[PDB]
Amino acid sequence: FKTIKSDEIFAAAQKLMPGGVSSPVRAFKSVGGQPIVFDRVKDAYAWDVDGNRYIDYVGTWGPAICGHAHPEVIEALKVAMEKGTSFGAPCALENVLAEMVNDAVPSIEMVRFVNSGTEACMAVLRIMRAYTGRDKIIKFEGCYHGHADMFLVKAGSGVATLGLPSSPGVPKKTTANTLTTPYNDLEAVKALFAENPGEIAGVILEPIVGNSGFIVPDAGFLEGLREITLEHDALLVFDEVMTGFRIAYGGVQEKFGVTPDLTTLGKIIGGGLPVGAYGGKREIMQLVAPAGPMYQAGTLSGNPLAMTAGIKTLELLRQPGTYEYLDQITKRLSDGLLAIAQETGHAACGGQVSGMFGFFFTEGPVHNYEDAKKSDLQKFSRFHRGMLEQGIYLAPSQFEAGFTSLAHTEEDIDATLAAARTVMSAL
Amino acid sequence: FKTIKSDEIFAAAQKLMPGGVSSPVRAFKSVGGQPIVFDRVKDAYAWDVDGNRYIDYVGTWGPAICGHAHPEVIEALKVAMEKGTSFGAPCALENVLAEMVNDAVPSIEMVRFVNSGTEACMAVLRIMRAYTGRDKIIKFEGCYHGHNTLTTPYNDLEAVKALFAENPGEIAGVILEPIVGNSGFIVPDAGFLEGLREITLEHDALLVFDEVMTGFRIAYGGVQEKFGVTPDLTTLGKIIGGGLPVGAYGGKREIMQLVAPAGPMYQAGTLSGNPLAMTAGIKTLELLRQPGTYEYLDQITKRLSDGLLAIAQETGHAACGGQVSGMFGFFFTEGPVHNYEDAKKSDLQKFSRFHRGMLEQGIYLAPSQFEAGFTSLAHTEEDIDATLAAARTVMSAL
Numbered sequence A: 001f002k003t004i005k006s007d008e009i010f011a012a013a014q015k016l017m018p019g020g021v022s023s024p025v026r027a028f029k030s031v032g033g034q035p036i037v038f039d040r041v042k043d044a045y046a047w048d049v050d051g052n053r054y055i056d057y058v059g060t061w062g063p064a065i066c067g068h069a070h071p072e073v074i075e076a077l078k079v080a081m082e083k084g085t086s087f088g089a090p091c092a093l094e095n096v097l098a099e100m101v102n103d104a105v106p107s108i109e110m111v112r113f114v115n116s117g118t119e120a121c122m123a124v125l126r127i128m129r130a131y132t133g134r135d136k137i138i139k140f141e142g143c144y145h146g147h148a149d150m151f152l153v154k155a156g157s158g159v160a161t162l163g164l165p166s167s168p169g170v171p172k173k174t175t176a177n178t179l180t181t182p183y184n185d186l187e188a189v190k191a192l193f194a195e196n197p198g199e200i201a202g203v204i205l206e207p208i209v210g211n212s213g214f215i216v217p218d219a220g221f222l223e224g225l226r227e228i229t230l231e232h233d234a235l236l237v238f239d240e241v242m243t244g245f246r247i248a249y250g251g252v253q254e255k256f257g258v259t260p261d262l263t264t265l266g267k268i269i270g271g272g273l274p275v276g277a278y279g280g281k282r283e284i285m286q287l288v289a290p291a292g293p294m295y296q297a298g299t300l301s302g303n304p305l306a307m308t309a310g311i312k313t314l315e316l317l318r319q320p321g322t323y324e325y326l327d328q329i330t331k332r333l334s335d336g337l338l339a340i341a342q343e344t345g346h347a348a349c350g351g352q353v354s355g356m357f358g359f360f361f362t363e364g365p366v367h368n369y370e371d372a373k374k375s376d377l378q379k380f381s382r383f384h385r386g387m388l389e390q391g392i393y394l395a396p397s398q399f400e401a402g403f404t405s406l407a408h409t410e411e412d413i414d415a416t417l418a419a420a421r422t423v424m425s426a427l
Numbered sequence B: 001f002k003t004i005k006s007d008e009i010f011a012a013a014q015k016l017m018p019g020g021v022s023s024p025v026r027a028f029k030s031v032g033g034q035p036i037v038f039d040r041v042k043d044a045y046a047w048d049v050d051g052n053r054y055i056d057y058v059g060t061w062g063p064a065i066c067g068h069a070h071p072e073v074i075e076a077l078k079v080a081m082e083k084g085t086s087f088g089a090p091c092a093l094e095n096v097l098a099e100m101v102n103d104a105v106p107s108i109e110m111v112r113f114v115n116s117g118t119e120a121c122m123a124v125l126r127i128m129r130a131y132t133g134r135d136k137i138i139k140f141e142g143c144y145h146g147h148n149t150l151t152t153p154y155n156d157l158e159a160v161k162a163l164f165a166e167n168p169g170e171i172a173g174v175i176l177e178p179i180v181g182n183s184g185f186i187v188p189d190a191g192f193l194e195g196l197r198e199i200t201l202e203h204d205a206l207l208v209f210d211e212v213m214t215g216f217r218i219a220y221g222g223v224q225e226k227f228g229v230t231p232d233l234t235t236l237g238k239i240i241g242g243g244l245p246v247g248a249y250g251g252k253r254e255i256m257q258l259v260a261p262a263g264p265m266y267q268a269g270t271l272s273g274n275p276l277a278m279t280a281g282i283k284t285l286e287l288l289r290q291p292g293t294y295e296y297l298d299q300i301t302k303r304l305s306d307g308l309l310a311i312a313q314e315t316g317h318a319a320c321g322g323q324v325s326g327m328f329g330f331f332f333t334e335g336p337v338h339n340y341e342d343a344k345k346s347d348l349q350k351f352s353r354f355h356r357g358m359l360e361q362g363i364y365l366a367p368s369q370f371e372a373g374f375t376s377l378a379h380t381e382e383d384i385d386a387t388l389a390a391a392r393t394v395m396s397a398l
């Protein structure tokens, strides 16, 4: 397994960028260090600068649900860019995507496009407080909602992988308004409301967690959050930046029948380009400028190129058999890894919903972040590296959910299961 | 001059998005409320969904410095997307753009790419505070950095002096647009930046230049290079994206090391450093490295600016402003404008009439008196001639 070129480039990048990467999640520090430099990706595969080919289960972290470099999306982008990539003024495509998002997401009646999930969440945070007139938020331990200050509290994703504390650089007076509770813990949330009467603007969360590994809400958890938030006139905010368009066309809210008041979107809606969005109940969105007083702008927001990527992507997802397929190949893969761990004598757990799955090296089961942290991180590290040598690219972290795409073939899955057999048999 | 299609599309957008736009200013609420919907842009022009063409001085708010849909940028993008638009892992192009940005901006020795100027600013404010262990940050009224904060009049060193004194050992640093564009075009008075650098070093505080708009426009190395004042941290955006969503923040190495995964301060981004966006930025900078780039911008823009002012002069309209490279401003007030309060004296009703007149003359100016104007390498001398000819007509009828 040669990673000569990757190491050469990564060594140079460390002198040019923090940690030699544009995002901490790509660090590889919890998997034995030494990230691999991609040269190109297509369908379910990625190719190293060293020429090594991998069956990719990262999908650039969610966006590539239609597969890498889908020809119809690339074709649409080629045609679109000839018309200029950014206008700085309104364009028809914004209306088209907006209309598509409004019809796809139950809670969304009005939407505002931004450029990333971080911007969408930061915006929804501001809108929650501006709408309710309350300053305190409730976020769950292990959930990640971008790096806006108030969200850097018991955050998952890179924060969990890198074992960092609540990020410094944030005034403690700002994080004071961020209350935290264990995921899947209603009573804890009930208690928080009782302790801060009239101060909770709302409850924000990943309706299905992917940033502290894969964690699904227990029966009644989402229904309960909607119930209690309604009781205190608090908003329920679904961060479907990762689950959006992946768990289902309408995300977790549609698939589980629980409708929030606001929801953020990202990744997939950008179809491979930088895009995000936040929307929800019309009466709440009307506070957003220029309709309302809450100022939120963006130079590249709603640019024609990004809108084209999003529209084409959603159009592909609307075709029949799409989510059926994702759940079909992902369940087999998921069941495979577990059946393999069992046979090879490794304590493991996890599951999957549509094209999103998780595999923990712990008997579990996992219901919250604390349960996830009990995974054998040393084992995962050896497992992640062995899979890499076997041609399988997994997220360099035990706290990141895995992704499959419409491009992964039954063949690719079998090959992935074979690799896992070989890797776990040697763990 | 019809805009039927624009009105219809905008009317429908108001039911789909707040104000029917993805960004406040686009709604034209400061100049009548009748926005024009773009279908395509090219070189120095923009086309309506109604078929109307305009000589564009917005340049999508800064990014289109090389001209709209530059054929060489589009080609690079086509070549690049065949390999996938986003990897989610390191790619060689990131090293390339990083090196170019490091070589281009004096203060940057290490850079971190993001997807917008707002992300850059969020991160830079938090880094300032993490590096100094202080919570207070000083900004200026009229300066924009996306959206414990002490304000102060722009071009006012004494007010800054007072802020440090009234908050001993609490000021992480001072952040500002080295040259203002978000409250109209306002240049720093002689010694202002030098002053800020002196006072910040004086109090072991950081100096941060928000060059999201000035970067690569005022000069290849932004204001810090042109005016020769070096901050500790700088944010970049707009032009580094070459028309795509890209931002960045960087500065002294020892400071940037605190950024994860190198340090404890967290900041991440799924689309950060994607090959497509890196390609757009790389091509854009390579084009700006060609001969006569900034000379040309400074030339046509000086003519434009002087022209507008001369026309206001000849037509009896109090006006002020000026330009630096391909960035300029025009205020309907005699000023001159040194800060936000000065800018606020401008005659907004007059600017609105002017904007609409220019629009009808085939000139697309920023739909706000408080926005700097921009030129591109695509703007020809004739475009400028046509523009001034239009400005004459409109101001004559104002």
Ligand SMILES: Cc1ncc(COP(=O)(O)O)c(CNC[C@@H](N)CCC(=O)O)c1O
Pocket: A023, A024, A025, A061, A062, A115, A116, A117, A118, A119, A121, A144, A145, A146, A147, A157, A206, A210, A211, A239, A240, A241, A242, A243, A266, A267, A276, A400, B268, B269, B270, B271
């Ligand atoms: C639920 C949720 N909410 C908000 C975000 C941030 O969105 P953004 O990266 O587009 O800025 C995310 C980002 N997830 C991205 C990760 N898979 C790792 C990639 C990274 O951070 O660079 C998320 O999952």
Ligand SMILES: *Cc1c(COP(=O)(O)O)cnc(C)c1O
Pocket: A297, A298, A299, A300, B115, B116, B117, B118, B119, B121, B144, B145, B146, B177, B181, B182, B210, B211, B212, B213, B237, B238, B247
């Ligand atoms: C444009 C601008 C920003 C905002 O950047 P976006 O890419 O719109 O998020 C920040 N600061 C300044 C000075 C700007 O001009």
Ligand SMILES: NC[C@@H](N)CCC(=O)O
Pocket: A087, A088, A089, A297, A298, A299, A300, B022, B023, B024, B025, B026, B060, B061, B144
């Ligand atoms: N900060 C706001 C302006 N750059 C306007 C962006 C737009 O609407 O295109």
